[PDB]
Design a protein around this ligand. Sequence first.
Ligand SMILES: *[C@H](O)[C@H](C[C@@H]1CCNC1=O)NC(=O)[C@H](CC(C)C)NC(=O)OCc1ccccc1
Ligand SMILES: *[C@H](O)[C@H](C[C@@H]1CCNC1=O)NC(=O)[C@H](CC(C)C)NC(=O)OCc1ccccc1
Lengths: 303, 303
Amino acid sequence: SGFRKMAFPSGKVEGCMVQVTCGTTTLNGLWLDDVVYCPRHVICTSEDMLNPNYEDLLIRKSNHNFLVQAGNVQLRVIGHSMQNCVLKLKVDTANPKTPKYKFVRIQPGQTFSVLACYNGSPSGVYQCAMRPNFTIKGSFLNGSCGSVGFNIDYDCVSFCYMHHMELPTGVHAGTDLEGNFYGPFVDRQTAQAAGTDTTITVNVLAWLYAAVINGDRWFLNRFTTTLNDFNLVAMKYNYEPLTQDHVDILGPLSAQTGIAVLDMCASLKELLQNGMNGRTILGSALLEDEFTPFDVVRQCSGV
Amino acid sequence: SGFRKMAFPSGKVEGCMVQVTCGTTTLNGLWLDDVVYCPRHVICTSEDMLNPNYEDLLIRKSNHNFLVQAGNVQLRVIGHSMQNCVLKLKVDTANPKTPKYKFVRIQPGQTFSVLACYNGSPSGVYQCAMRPNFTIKGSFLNGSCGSVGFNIDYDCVSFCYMHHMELPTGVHAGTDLEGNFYGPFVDRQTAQAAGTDTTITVNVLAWLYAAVINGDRWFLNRFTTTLNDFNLVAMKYNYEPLTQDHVDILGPLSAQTGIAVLDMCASLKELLQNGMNGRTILGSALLEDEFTPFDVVRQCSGV
Ligand SMILES: *[C@H](O)[C@H](C[C@@H]1CCNC1=O)NC(=O)[C@H](CC(C)C)NC(=O)OCc1ccccc1
Ligand SMILES: *[C@H](O)[C@H](C[C@@H]1CCNC1=O)NC(=O)[C@H](CC(C)C)NC(=O)OCc1ccccc1
């Protein structure tokens, strides 16, 4: 038993990380088959970054302006192209470590593993949820751009995130691997703010089920509630409304524990209205919303 | 910026995980050069596990009783031996993916990455601290034994933990890679309890410095305290005493922030005596003690 925030094993992605240098700018790229993907702002200079015109900037580049390094081996760039906010550099070598992969775009409320990288070299792995306001709460320093986020399903890597920037609140923004930003953000050095966020209700309930599966039961009660009466409370506390599809997604956890979803919603209502009174749930004094129902089932089915 | 609990990239260890089966028992092993390491209780049966005599049990085994699988390739066992609570199986093939490695034993208060595995296949990665009572707070189901814990330093993997069992409180116990248990535990199915735990004071202060580096400053104050007067408060709240070596270890973080250690100790004293009054620190409503000073420096020096 036990419940821990857990990343996917990162080996398959570590074999894809390279270093991309253009001018005095160095960041990370993703080498799949004979293409390297990286943030297009690698071609910017300090002054270009206030309001660059990337079509102009790229036209003024040629293949020899891009230095790609896969460990010690330098890869020869034989083509370059822009796809939205990502640059695609064709190289003279197919990555022999290319896994089965897909490019997928994730929804707010879903999770993925981030492999933080610097100078083409992986440094650490951790889990993130895409917030309702299309930001993630990550850990990224200068040089981390081009680090990617991903999920793994039966040795197929679904890439969903490439890192591009940090907002003033300390949260992080980036694109899918088609180079389309998550959220209303742009890759230039101007004042940008995340919209207001909300709490992911279905994830909180999933984590409450994880708590019960692991022996935390103090917050349970005999009451049930209706979907409508719960959603009235949710709106008050800046929680997303619960839909019948969310109840259905929680079905398997409801079955394993014998606690109906609307039974657990009564617990959440009382937790929202009364707090915890000094107690904790799975070691947290706060209600956690960064675990999906799938994340919970992944750790808890064997208990 | 940003501060996240972060595992080491797990690729180098994923290339070492195999599956070890004996009788109806299957768990994980660690394949380095031509030796596979696994928990010795793989040789037990359901009834052996109450109070096994492992020397007897091993003498009654031979090489052909052990089935080792590295993916689809079956490895031939050519020798077996016991080293304390781990079994060493010599196989006919050196692992071509063997990294530079060491076997190290860690101290309470230190952290490491756990690569959770099932049937020889990695499933997820996360960070653990060795508690003062020699347990870890992990996530392990049936079949996870032989999963290992490790740190990485300049492409050298220091292995420090192999998983063996779960205690009744839901916490986890195991050995170093020499097969010597952390703590006063034994590998048999009897009633065993962890001693009382304490909070790792130097880690809490390290996390407070991480908070300041990331812009959380509300808990700071103008006061300083003495080491003796702090340790009087620490004893009251079940915190470990702070030593001059702990102040020294925190030196670099103290320098980066311009906040002396005994200056931060005054903050911690007030937090212990007054709580947070509804506020959070790096997104936590509780004081966190699972980050070492090294873990913090690793993420925060570039800020
Ligand atoms: C790319 O490596 C870098 C990642 C930033 C650097 C600090 N934390 C991150 O996530 N991205 C940028 O530097 C980005 C480039 C623009 C052309 C989009 N700008 C940016 O993030 O500015 C915000 C910032 C905040 C704090 C420190 C440095 C930059
Ligand atoms: C080895 O795979 C297994 C790991 C346990 C299983 C559940 N969570 C874990 O960490 N170890 C054992 O099963 C261990 C074997 C003895 C011979 C040492 N016994 C054990 O952990 O018993 C406690 C237990 C608690 C909850 C479920 C199952 C077993």
